[PDB]
Each structure stands twice: as structure tokens, then as C-alpha cells.
Ligand binder design. Sequence first.
Ligand code: NA
Ligand code: NA
Ligand code: NA
Lengths: 93, 93, 93, 335, 335, 335
Amino acid sequence: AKPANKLVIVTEKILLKKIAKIIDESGAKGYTVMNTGGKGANIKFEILTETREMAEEIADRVAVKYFNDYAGIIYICSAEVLYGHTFCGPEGC
Amino acid sequence: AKPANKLVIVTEKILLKKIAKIIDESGAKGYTVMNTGGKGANIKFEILTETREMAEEIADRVAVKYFNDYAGIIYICSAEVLYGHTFCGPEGC
Amino acid sequence: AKPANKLVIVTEKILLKKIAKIIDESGAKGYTVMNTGGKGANIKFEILTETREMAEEIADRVAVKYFNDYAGIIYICSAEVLYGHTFCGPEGC
Amino acid sequence: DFLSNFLTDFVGQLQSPTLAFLIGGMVIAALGTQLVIPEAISTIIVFMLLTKIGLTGGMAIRNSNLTEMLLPVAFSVILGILIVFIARFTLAKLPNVRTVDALATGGLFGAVSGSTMAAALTTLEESKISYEAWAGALYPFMDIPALVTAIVVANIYLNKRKRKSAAARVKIWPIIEESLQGPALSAMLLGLALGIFTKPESVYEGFYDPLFRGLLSILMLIMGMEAWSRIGELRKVAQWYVVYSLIAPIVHGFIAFGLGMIAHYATGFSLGGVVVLAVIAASSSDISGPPTLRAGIPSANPSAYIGSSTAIGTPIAIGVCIPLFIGLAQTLGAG
Amino acid sequence: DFLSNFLTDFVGQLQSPTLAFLIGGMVIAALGTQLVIPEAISTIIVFMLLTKIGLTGGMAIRNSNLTEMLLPVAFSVILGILIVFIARFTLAKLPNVRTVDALATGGLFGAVSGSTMAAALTTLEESKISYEAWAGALYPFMDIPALVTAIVVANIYLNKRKRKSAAARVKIWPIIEESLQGPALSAMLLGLALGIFTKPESVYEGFYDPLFRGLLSILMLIMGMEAWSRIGELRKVAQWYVVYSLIAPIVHGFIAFGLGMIAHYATGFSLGGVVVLAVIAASSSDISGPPTLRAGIPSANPSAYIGSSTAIGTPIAIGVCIPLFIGLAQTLGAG
Amino acid sequence: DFLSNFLTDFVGQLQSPTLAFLIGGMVIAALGTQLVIPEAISTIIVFMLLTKIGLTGGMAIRNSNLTEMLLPVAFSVILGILIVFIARFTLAKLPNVRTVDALATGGLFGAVSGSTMAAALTTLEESKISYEAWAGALYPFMDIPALVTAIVVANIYLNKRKRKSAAARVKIWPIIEESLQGPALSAMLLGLALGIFTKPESVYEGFYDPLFRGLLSILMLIMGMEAWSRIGELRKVAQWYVVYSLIAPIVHGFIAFGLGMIAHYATGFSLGGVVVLAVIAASSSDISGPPTLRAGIPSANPSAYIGSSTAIGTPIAIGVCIPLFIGLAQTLGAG
Ligand code: NA
Ligand code: NA
Ligand code: NA
């Protein structure tokens, strides 16, 4: 029952593949994209990271490359993983 | 890398615009609506608030006006914002 | 304003009804299913539990019965319920 | 009506695609198919069915006296208001039937179902019987008073349980304007406006008319499926609701046919035209009403009125009322 | 079959909309279009294609001997069970081919593809060749044994790797009843029941029949697109799967045509009718099977069977098997 | 053009389903219907409209000289590049109009709208005027230079505000290959390739052609609804954009008609054929462009170009340009 970071990136629909590829390269395990919408239509990534340096590094890349002209907010929760083979103990945990 | 509240309102489809307008008035920055469903079809707001008094005040209004005859659960997480212009430092952060 | 666990089960589309029935039996209040997708198409349960023993017991059942051949990650957040009749004070709270 | 008719018409119409598709989706649902007509496909079927119904509504209005339509429109309204009051003096007053529940169930039974109306128009065509082509445009003159009356007689009973509980304001315009903006009724309102002012004959005979009965069979499948799902909703409320859901649509229709029949005499209104009024009357809102009533009568329990209107209201106005009120107009044809 | 035929038929049928739309979606997908036929549009195309196929299935059953259909139904079943066993003694037994993988890949190749069947029926019509109009209703008598046999011979091989690993129960009814509730097969079951008992001639000739080939061209585009996506799935499993996916549908068809051809002799079954059996046989489940096999054989790797059936099984039974088994029945026509 | 024509044609064409459905969805949207044509239904309408337009494009290319098409293709390109430059020397240079904003608004006005083109083709048919059946296939030769030129003259103005701000590289192939993969343009590219090489006459005359005007009326409703939503976007940017959105499509068309009219003389290009070029020119990207410009010109404000192109660009090329350039070609018909 190990701990991890829930990095959330809720941003513009266009970026989907461009952010999906930034995550794929970070060394992140996997991610979950949702369709969403809102004011302040949208997209939402949920990325679980082992290190916090990774959740930041991902949030740093998406905000260096895309966030001066596309909208979107990156917030981090702090969750706690009970199961998942590619993450908690490969078995049990 | 400032902290904030993740106020979640998962309630009935009908209310969408009536709750979307209660949030818009609170002084909340923005929000994110999802389509969801469940038992105990649905809707889910995710609202990030600077103060906790605001996340409560929003949760107070939606529960004074709509929650005696429409279903729905308002829970608060406690996240930590890394980026977003209209919220964390307008730049960097 | 009582505290609770946000148990998240993001797993394969097939399982929807088989996991929806494991949750229904646990003694869980309700749940919220989303449609999602991702790499590492998908599904996501959000279950709010009074005890942590329940959020685990649910996560234990879904991982004993389905997680050796279907994919999916169960992580727990730790939220804080402000309203909901079948959960916080039946009134106010 | 003739028994020799309502039986003929029934076993006949029960073999037509329209009804065959209703009870059809009722039994694949009862066998638990994992079949689902997508939500996107059932809203465009409604759009087609209702622009089509509205395009001829509007195209035959640009000849008609607007005197011929006078009496059927006022009866179209008076039924919608009355039906709500009947649910108020004959179901709300029974045990374990909260009045605010029955008033919403009366506002769905006063409100119209297009898919039942649509099922009744392609029956009259199919059975070589004719009706005013603006008869479709009666539908909104009932759908809106009934919904309004339910909302306004509801938020009165509760203002009377307020003023009584102490001794010991309803905005109508916004709800009949919200009702007018609903997708279904707007689909009609657009088809109507198109065929009065523009000339949409081209696209009607090549698109909206060819597909009307084909998309209706799907919608009729849909509506007999969603009719079976809502059946569990009836066990949760009283069991007086099941008696109302059965006999109210046969009563609401006769009161309309009787009124209707004041114009095979007064203004010439057709025997087909009063079958359309009787079937509009009997139908039970299904899609449009339940949101408009969730909103104006929120203390109402949606098992009581959504389970009454959709599980039994619709399968009876399609299965039993169409072949019964086609059969009554048909007996009025002696020799 | 005649080489002078299978070549003619092939370059001919490769220019028909049905096949032209399969390889068509195969190359826009190969050029990476961002094109997507919505999920809602492809489930209603399946519904149309399969209610249509079922409406005539059911409409011509209400004349037929139910003796004429006896032999093709029993061959329809025996192929579905056999094909699974062939995948068991001829692919499961090769290296780097987990048996529980091949048994699922055999249960998809035993199971039917409606869109391949549908592509084969509108070819036989298009090529002025005739077939029993209940030939469509053979489809479920194969789709279900094959799926079942795969599930039951799988959960036996694993009960034999249990009892062996120690020395050193499968509920069939629920899976053939789950199979019967699938959307596609239910769409058929409804169209069949409609045309036996009700009289859906009206809506068939005005809706379900006019759109059959037009919605099939889309579905054939879809199925050649989703055929290219699954190609990456084949590199991840063995490379024996690619040899099976190619030659199994030409073998499975002949065994059917041979059996089929036991009734241009025994009960009169048409040359068109055995082309439908041969093409039903060769087809590879695609949509219906992979969920039913994800569930009953979960240790099976969906790259092995979903990549075999959808990436190569379908493009071959449409591209190569239809013009080959139309051409064989056609050579049986000397003089 | 003749005033006695452009008036006749206008009040006439304003009563046709195509335009009647544009201003139709403009007013139900203006009355705030809760009506919504599902996203899934509007992408399949685009697919139908554009495979249909492409199937005949491709079917009449397999006769044509590929000399007749030479001059209209090169004018088809030169307008797309020019229009962007016109937005650069005549709107970008005005106050409160960021150049990178106008260059994107020029790349949408250079880019094509299929639904406006489609609305113009079913007008020419409807008005018994004829055009090259490959005239549709001019559309991609403008849609892509215009988008590219906007992206490349944008990422130059910003490389000039870089090299100036210091004193005190754009990959083109990927964007014209991304443009080629868009759903709409791919739908065309597939219909075109089908009718050159395969023989899709069967499914065209039985499906893609019958539904073209019927699905276009919906798309025309959609496009006059989404034309009203974007109107709030115009208040947020300058008010020079409203003057451009109005007069640019009447200017862009004449420059095309003038060029077009170099081949009622040079290579025989029809009067119908130059109406198609003029209307292709005037149209404003709407769906395809705004993503391609969000991506290559990201500092561009989507209120400036998405609000200009969709709120006023489209309702004017349908409402005013089609009946004006049909009327000009029509006056060139003296005696
Ligand atoms: Na009614
Ligand atoms: Na098969
Ligand atoms: Na243009």
C-alpha cells in the first residue's frame, strides 16, 4: 500500500496527443484521459507518479511548451496506491 | 506551487446550469463539469478554490437551494496547484 | 463536515457490471462511474467510504477476483465530505 | 365504438410495424438484451419525426381558415388543463398518493407524447383515413397548459400546506417559454415556420417524409424498451398509480373524442382530425414533461409520474387507444 | 473453383462498393486519416444491417419447410464447434502459441461476422445469384457453439494444467444466453421474430432494404479501418498467428462448401445458400466474440485473437473468400 | 450582376430548404432553443456530404482532359494564398487588430467551407445550371494553401518582431499533410479515389445522392446555429473584424469570378464552374481551419478568426454570395 502523486492536467482539447506524448516520455507509468468541459469542451489527464520530481517535471514540460497560449490548470493531489501491477508490488500490495 | 481546495459536487443532470451559475457567482476562478453516472446519468463539478471559506460557501449554497429534493454529494479534496495563470503565479509558479 | 476515503478504481470496460456489483455488496453507500481512456477505452469508479477498512475491502475484492487477467489501478485519495444525506449528517453537516 | 372494429383494428394494428415495434422492444427488453439504440440516434429520430410532422403542419396552415382550427385548439388547451385537475380530484385524493405526486403525474398525462401522436398519424395514413394536416400542430397547445397547470396547482397545494401549518407566486411565463424551447417542440416549431413561409416541399418529399415511418419504428422500439425499464419504478410508489396509468388514457381520450366530435358537427373538423385529438390527449409526456416537472414540482417523486407516464401511459395509448379511437371514428360511418 | 472465375469475380468484386469500401478504409487508415465514423453511427449501422437481414430471414421462414433448413442448421453448428477444435490441433500445438490463446482465436474464427455475411449477401444479390432468404438465420447457430466451445475447451485445458501441476464446471447455458443477448444477434432475433409473426413488409421495402447497401459501405469502410489498427497487435504475439489468420478462412470455407454441397444434393439447398454457409464459416467474430471471450477465457491474450480475427480474418473473408466461393458455386454450372 | 437577378435569386433562394435552414437555425438559436443536433450526427452529415461530393468529383475525373482542370486548379490555389495576403495588407494593418490575428482570419477566409460549397452545388442543380462535376475537387487546392500561407506568413511576422526586438523555419510539408488528413477533406479524398478507380455508381445513386440535400438541410441548420453562438466572440475582439467578415466574402468572390471568367474564354470552364470557384473562394473555413490555425498560429486569438469566419463569413457566403454569383453568371446570358 505505497504512496504516490495524482498529477491532474485539465487543459484544451487540441493538446490531447501533444500532451499524451509529453507524459509518455516522462517515465510515467500510464495515464487516464477524460473528456470534460468547463468555463473559467475540455480534457483532463490523471497521471500517477512515483516521485514528486516526476509529477513536477511533467507539469513543468506541459507548462513550458503549451501554457503561454493554450489554457489549462495543472494541480497535484496526493493519493495512496493499493493495487496495480506496474506500480505497487507486482502481486498483492 | 500554492495550495488550494478541490471541491467536488457530483449531483443530478438537471441542475447543470443552475449549479454552474451558483459557482460562477461565488467568486470561484473556474470549474470543470464532467458527465458521469452512478447508483447509491449524473454530473460532477470540480471547483478549485483559493480559500476554504469559498469551497464551503459554494457547497453551502448548492445544498441550501437544491439538496432537499435533488440528490448529490459534495466532498472536498485538498490539492496543491502547480500552474494556471488565473490562480497560481501569473507566470512560472 | 465528516471525513471519508475516496477509493478510485480505474480498470477495463468489460468489468463495469462485475465491479459495480462488488461495490454494491460491500456496504458502500454509492459510487460514480465515468467513461475514461488511457494508455500505460477505460472505466473509473469513485467510491466514498466511511471506514478505511471498507475502501480497502472493496479494493481487496476487485483485486482478488479480476486483477490477475484484467488491467486496472486502484488508488485511494483522502477527502472530506461536506454534504450528502446518505453519508454526512442527514440534514445540515 | 364497435367491438367488431376495435378487435379488428387491434389485431391488425398490432401487426403493423409501428405497434409491432413497440411490443417488440418491450419483449427484447424483457428478455434483457444488451441492445441499446444510442442516445444520439434517438434524439435525431425525434428531430426527424418532429420536423416532418411540423413541415406539413406548417404547409397546410398556409391554406386553412384559422377558423376551422379555432375550436380544436381551444379544446386542445382545455383538455391539457382539465386532465391535471382530474388527476387532482381522483388520484391525489387516494391513500399513499401524495398530492404533489399525482399533480405531476397529471401534468405528464395532460402533456403530449409526440411519438404516440406520430404513431397515430402513420396509422391513420396506413389505414386510409384522413386528418387535417395541421392536426399535428395541436400538440403544443396541450403539452404546455398541462405542464403549467401541474406546476401551478402543485405550488398552490404546497402554499396551502404552508398557510395551514402556520395557523397552528409561480412564474408561469418562464415555464411556457421554457416548454417552447424544448428540443422536440422546437423541432416542430421550426418545421411549422418553414412550411408556412419558406417552400420546403423539395426536401420534405425526398427526406423527411420517406424516413418518417422507418425512424418511427426505431423510436417505437425505443419507447417500448424504455417502457419496460421504468416498470420497477412503479413498485416503489403506491399501487393506485397502476390503476390510473391504465384507465386514465382511455378516459382522457373519450373526453377528447367527445369534444372532438363537437366538430364533425360545428366547424367540419374531420373524423381523422378528432382521432388525432383523442390520441394526443391520451398520450403521456415521456421525454419533454419529466424535466419540466422535475424542475417546477421538485418535491414530486419521479417514480410516481415518470413510472406512470412511460411504463404504462405510452404502451396503452399506442397499443390500445389508437386501435380503439380509430375504431370509434370508424363506426361513425353507418350503412 | 475455376481460376478464370475467381480472378474475374475478384477484380470485379474488388470494384464493387462493398469491397471497395473495405480496402478503401484500409488505405485512408494506412495514410493516417484523422477520420472517425462515430461509435454511435457504427452501432446503428449494425442494427440496420441486422434487423434488415433478420426481417427477411423471418419473412421467408413463414413459408419454408423447416426440413429444408434442417441440414444447413446442423452443419451450421458442427462447423462452429469443429473450427475451434481445428485451432486446437493445428495452432495451439505450435511453439510460442499458448493454447488458451489459440482456443480463443479459434472461437472467433468459428464465430460469425455479420458484416462479412452482410457483405456476402449484397454480393450474391449484386451478382444475380440467389440464396434461401432464411440463410441469414444460420449465423447465430454458428456464432454461439464456436464461442461456447472455445470457452469450454479452454477452461478444460486449464483444468488439465491444474490436475497435472498438483500430481507433481463451466456454465454453458449462461454463455449461450449471454451470446443471445448481444446487440447484433438481438437485432437479428428481433427482425426474425417480426417477419415470422407480424407483417413488417411496409417498413422493410421503404427503409431497412433501401439503406442496406449504403450503410454496409460505411460499415465496410469501418471494418477495413479497424482492420488496420489491430495490425500492431500481431507483432506482439507469435508469428504463427499470421499464417493461421491467412489460410484458416480459406480452409474453414471449403469444409463448409463441401458440407454445404451435401445439399445441392440432399435437401435442395441452393448454390447461393452454400455460398452463404461457406462465407458465414470463413468470417471472424470481430465485435461480438471478443467480449464473450475476454470474459470466459480471461487468461487469453487479446492481441492473439482480436488481432488475428479483425486484422486479417475479416479482410480475407471479404476480399478473397467471397469472390472465391461465389466462383466455386459458379463453376458448378457447366455447359 | 443584374439587380433584377440578385434580387430574384435571393428572395427565391432564401425560400429554398438550403438557405431556409441556415437562417432557420439562426432564429431558433436566437430564441434560445435547447435544441442540439448531436456531435455524432453532424460529423456523419459531413462525411455523407463530402463522400457524395467526392464520388462524382472522382467519377467525372475519369473522363476529363486534366487540361480543362489545369487553369481552375491554379486559380484555386492562387486565391487561397492571395486572400491571406489581402487580410495582411488590409485588416492586420488597422488599429486594435493584432496582425497574427488577422493572418489567421485570412487563413480561414482563404480556406474553404464544404457546407457552403455543398449549399452552392445543390443550388446550381436546383436552379437548372450546370457545372463541371470535378468542380468540387477544387476545394482542397484552396483549403490547404490558405491555411499554410496564414501559418507561414504568421510565423514570419513573429520572426520579424523577434529580430527587431533584439537589434534594440516553419515546416510546411507537415501542415499540408495534416490538412490532407482532416476528416472532411479525407472523406472527399476517399470519394474521389473511389469514383476514379472503383465503380461506386451503385451506392451513389441509391444512398449518397438521395440523402445529400436532406442531410445538407440539417447541416445548414447546424451551421446557422453555430453561426449565432460565435457572435459573442466578436464583441471581445476589434470591430474592424465585423467589417471584414461582411465585405471580404463579396470581394473574395468577385476576384474568383473574374479569374473564373478567364475560362468561359480560355479552356471552356462553365458558367456553373466559375460560380463554384467564386463560392468556394468566399466561404470561410468554420470546422477544418480553426484547429489547423489553433496549432500553427497559437498566439492568434480564436475570437478574432473563429468568430469572424463562423458567425458572419458563413451566413454571408450562403445567404448573399450564392444568390449574387449565381445572378452574375446568369446575366452573362444576354438576349
Ligand atoms: Na396527453
Ligand atoms: Na466463422
Ligand atoms: Na475561401
